[PDB]
Amino acid sequence: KVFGRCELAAAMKRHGLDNYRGYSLGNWVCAAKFESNFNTQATNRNTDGSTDYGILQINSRWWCNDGRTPGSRNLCNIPCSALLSSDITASVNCAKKIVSDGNGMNAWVAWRNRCKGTDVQAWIRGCRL
């Protein structure tokens, strides 16, 4: 599923990402835009042989099991395929654990490089939230 910007903003707010660990909703929409272009089916292989999955590109090296990342962890206790659903519940629940891990949203490279230090409020412009 390819979310609309305001559509995703509404879902993320409903699942309680607005101000989670102090990150405003705009931060989460900006990250999803530049991690996945708001596409829940996005996947990307990493050099260490892990893969990134879903609208926030959650990595199989730590957070989920894909059966092909030997010696990896599964800290969200989910198959990585759960992270590609049109239902963002599993991605939000896993993102809350990632952002709580003590590096904040720096765990998301696209956030760090395209969102951090920008006015992320722009990402919720025009939405009825």
UniProtKB/Swiss-Prot annotation:
SUPFAM superfamilies for this protein: Lysozyme-like
Location of the protein in the cell: Secreted
Pfam family, one: Lys
Catalytic reaction equation(s): Hydrolysis of (1->4)-beta-linkages between N-acetylmuramic acid and N-acetyl-D-glucosamine residues in a peptidoglycan and between N-acetyl-D-glucosamine residues in chitodextrins
SMART domains on file: LYZ1
GO process terms (BP): cell wall macromolecule catabolic process; defense response to bacterium; defense response to Gram-negative bacterium; defense response to Gram-positive bacterium; killing of cells of another organism
E.C. designation(s): 3.2.1.17
A GO cellular-component term linked to this record: endoplasmic reticulum
Active-site positions on this chain: 35, 52
Binding site for substrate: 101
Domain named C-type lysozyme: residues: 1-129
Top-rank lineage group of the source organism: Eukaryota
Keyword line: Allergen, Antimicrobial, Bacteriolytic enzyme, Disulfide bond, Glycosidase, Hydrolase, Secreted, Signal
Molecular function terms from GO: beta-N-acetylglucosaminidase activity; identical protein binding; lysozyme activity
Covalent S-S links between cysteines: 6-127, 30-115, 64-80, 76-94
Group of enzyme by EC: hydrolase
Tissue: In the egg white and polymorphonuclear leukocytes.
Coiled coil: none
Family named by the database record: Belongs to the glycosyl hydrolase 22 family.
Function: Lysozymes have primarily a bacteriolytic function; those in tissues and body fluids are associated with the monocyte-macrophage system and enhance the activity of immunoagents. Has bacteriolytic activity against M.luteus.
PANTHER family named among the record's database cross-references: LYSOZYME C
Miscellaneous note of the record: Lysozyme C is capable of both hydrolysis and transglycosylation; it also shows a slight esterase activity. It acts rapidly on both peptide-substituted and unsubstituted peptidoglycan, and slowly on chitin oligosaccharides.
Assembly information from the UniProt record: Monomer.
Name this polypeptide is given: Lysozyme C
Organism (species): Gallus gallus
Taxon lineage: Eukaryota, Metazoa, Chordata, Craniata, Vertebrata
